Amino acid sequence: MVKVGGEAGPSVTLPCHYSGAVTSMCWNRGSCSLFTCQNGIVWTNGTHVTYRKDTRYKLLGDLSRRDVSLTIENTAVSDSGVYCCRVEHRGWFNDMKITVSLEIVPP
Ligand code: NA
Protein backbone atom coordinates (compact mmCIF):
# COMPACT_ATOMS: atom_id res chain seq x y z
CA MET A 1 0.00 0.00 0.00
CA VAL A 2 1.20 3.54 -0.76
CA LYS A 3 0.82 6.02 2.14
CA VAL A 4 0.57 9.76 1.44
CA GLY A 5 -0.92 12.78 3.14
CA GLY A 6 -0.31 16.12 4.80
CA GLU A 7 -2.15 18.95 6.55
CA ALA A 8 -5.36 20.15 4.99
CA GLY A 9 -4.93 22.75 2.31
CA PRO A 10 -1.73 22.04 0.36
CA SER A 11 -2.00 19.69 -2.57
CA VAL A 12 -1.06 16.01 -2.23
CA THR A 13 -0.03 13.59 -4.96
CA LEU A 14 -1.03 9.93 -4.93
CA PRO A 15 1.73 8.23 -6.93
CA CYS A 16 0.85 5.67 -9.57
CA HIS A 17 2.92 4.36 -12.50
CA TYR A 18 2.51 1.28 -14.67
CA SER A 19 4.40 -0.72 -17.23
CA GLY A 20 3.96 -1.69 -20.85
CA ALA A 21 1.98 0.02 -23.54
CA VAL A 22 0.05 3.18 -22.80
CA THR A 23 -3.52 2.28 -21.78
CA SER A 24 -6.61 3.73 -20.10
CA MET A 25 -6.96 4.02 -16.35
CA CYS A 26 -9.31 5.28 -13.67
CA TRP A 27 -8.96 6.47 -10.07
CA ASN A 28 -11.42 5.06 -7.56
CA ARG A 29 -12.39 6.85 -4.35
CA GLY A 30 -12.46 3.71 -2.23
CA SER A 31 -10.51 0.47 -1.87
CA CYS A 32 -9.61 -1.51 -4.95
CA SER A 33 -12.10 -4.27 -5.73
CA LEU A 34 -13.17 -6.70 -8.42
CA PHE A 35 -14.90 -4.30 -10.81
CA THR A 36 -13.53 -1.19 -12.53
CA CYS A 37 -13.71 1.97 -10.37
CA GLN A 38 -17.19 1.58 -8.91
CA ASN A 39 -16.79 5.02 -7.30
CA GLY A 40 -14.65 6.48 -10.01
CA ILE A 41 -13.38 10.04 -9.76
CA VAL A 42 -11.01 10.30 -12.78
CA TRP A 43 -11.01 8.48 -16.12
CA THR A 44 -8.44 8.59 -18.92
CA ASN A 45 -8.22 7.30 -22.47
CA GLY A 46 -4.48 6.67 -22.10
CA THR A 47 -3.27 10.10 -23.16
CA HIS A 48 -5.90 12.47 -21.72
CA VAL A 49 -8.32 12.80 -18.82
CA THR A 50 -11.82 12.26 -20.23
CA TYR A 51 -13.76 12.98 -17.03
CA ARG A 52 -13.16 14.08 -13.45
CA LYS A 53 -15.67 14.32 -10.61
CA ASP A 54 -14.01 17.40 -9.05
CA THR A 55 -11.79 20.06 -10.69
CA ARG A 56 -9.44 19.60 -7.71
CA TYR A 57 -8.43 16.23 -9.24
CA LYS A 58 -5.56 16.61 -11.72
CA LEU A 59 -3.17 14.25 -13.49
CA LEU A 60 -0.12 16.47 -13.71
CA GLY A 61 2.42 13.81 -14.69
CA ASP A 62 3.45 12.56 -18.07
CA LEU A 63 0.68 10.13 -19.09
CA SER A 64 2.68 9.07 -22.16
CA ARG A 65 5.38 7.82 -19.74
CA ARG A 66 2.73 5.96 -17.71
CA ASP A 67 2.70 8.45 -14.84
CA VAL A 68 -0.98 8.52 -13.84
CA SER A 69 -0.34 9.94 -10.34
CA LEU A 70 -3.34 11.87 -8.98
CA THR A 71 -2.86 15.33 -7.53
CA ILE A 72 -5.64 16.65 -5.27
CA GLU A 73 -5.55 20.44 -5.01
CA ASN A 74 -7.02 22.32 -2.04
CA THR A 75 -7.15 19.24 0.14
CA ALA A 76 -9.71 18.77 2.92
CA VAL A 77 -9.84 16.38 5.84
CA SER A 78 -12.80 14.68 4.14
CA ASP A 79 -10.51 13.64 1.26
CA SER A 80 -8.88 11.14 3.63
CA GLY A 81 -9.41 7.48 2.79
CA VAL A 82 -8.34 4.68 0.50
CA TYR A 83 -8.00 5.26 -3.26
CA CYS A 84 -7.39 2.80 -6.09
CA CYS A 85 -5.25 3.42 -9.15
CA ARG A 86 -6.64 1.03 -11.71
CA VAL A 87 -4.90 0.55 -15.04
CA GLU A 88 -7.16 -1.20 -17.55
CA HIS A 89 -6.07 -4.30 -19.40
CA ARG A 90 -7.75 -6.77 -21.71
CA GLY A 91 -8.35 -9.66 -19.36
CA TRP A 92 -10.91 -10.08 -16.56
CA PHE A 93 -8.26 -10.42 -13.89
CA ASN A 94 -5.16 -8.67 -15.08
CA ASP A 95 -5.73 -4.99 -14.42
CA MET A 96 -2.97 -3.28 -12.45
CA LYS A 97 -4.34 -2.08 -9.11
CA ILE A 98 -2.42 0.11 -6.64
CA THR A 99 -3.95 0.90 -3.27
CA VAL A 100 -3.18 4.35 -1.86
CA SER A 101 -4.01 5.55 1.63
CA LEU A 102 -4.52 9.32 1.92
CA GLU A 103 -4.29 11.04 5.31
CA ILE A 104 -5.30 14.73 5.39
CA VAL A 105 -4.97 15.99 8.94
CA PRO A 106 -6.75 18.98 10.49
CA PRO A 107 -4.64 22.20 10.70
NA1 NA B 1 0.60 -2.53 -15.96
Residue numbers in the entry: 4 to 110
Paper passage:
We crystallized the Ig V domains of hTIM-1 and hTIM-4 and determined the structures at a resolution of 1.3 Å and 2.3 Å, respectively, using the molecular replacement method. While hTIM-1 has only one molecule in the asymmetric unit, there are eight molecules of essentially the same structure present in the asymmetric unit of hTIM-4. Despite sharing overall structural similarities with other Ig V domains of TIM family proteins, hTIM-1 Ig V domain exhibits unique features that may be essential for its distinct biological roles. Most notably, hTIM-1 possesses a significantly short BC loop that is the most variable structural feature amongst Ig V domains of the TIM family. In addition the residues of BC loop carry smaller side chains when compared to other TIM family proteins. This structural feature coupled with the movement of FG loop of hTIM-1 away from the BC loop, creates a unique groove that merges with the PS binding cleft. Two residues (Arg 110 and Arg 86) in hTIM-1 (while the counterparts are Pro and Gly, respectively in other TIM family members) render the two walls of the groove positively charged. We show that the Ig V domain of hTIM-1, but not other TIM family members, interacts directly with the GP and more specifically with the RBD of EBOV in vitro. In addition, the single mutations R86/A86 and R110/A110, exhibiting 60% and 50% reduction, respectively, in the binding affinity of hTIM-1 to Ebola GP, confirmed the structural interpretation that the unique groove in hTIM-1 also participates in GP binding. Based on the above results, we conclude that all the three loops, BC, CC’ and FG, of hTIM-1 together constitute the binding sites to Ebola GP, of which the residues Arg 106, Trp 112, Phe 113, Asn 114, Asp 115 and Lys 117 are critically important for Ebola GP binding, while, the residues Arg 86, Arg 110 have moderate effects on GP binding. Additionally, we further identified a number of residues on these three loops, which are critical for the EBOV GP binding.
TIM family proteins exhibit a classical type I membrane protein structure with an N-terminal immunoglobulin variable Ig-like (Ig V) domain, a heavily O-linked-glycosylated mucin-like domain (MLD) and a short C-terminal cytoplasmic tail. Recent studies indicate that hTIM-1, with some other but not all phosphatidylserine (PS) binding receptors, functions as a common attachment factor for a range of enveloped viruses, including filoviruses, flaviviruses, HIV, etc., through direct interaction with PS of the viral envelope. The Ig V domains of hTIM-1 and hTIM-4, exhibit two antiparallel β sheets with the front and back faces formed by A, G, F, C, C′, C″ and B, E, D strands respectively. A hydrophobic cleft formed by CC’ and FG loops, located at an equivalent position in hTIM-1 and hTIM-4 structures represents the putative PS ligand binding site.
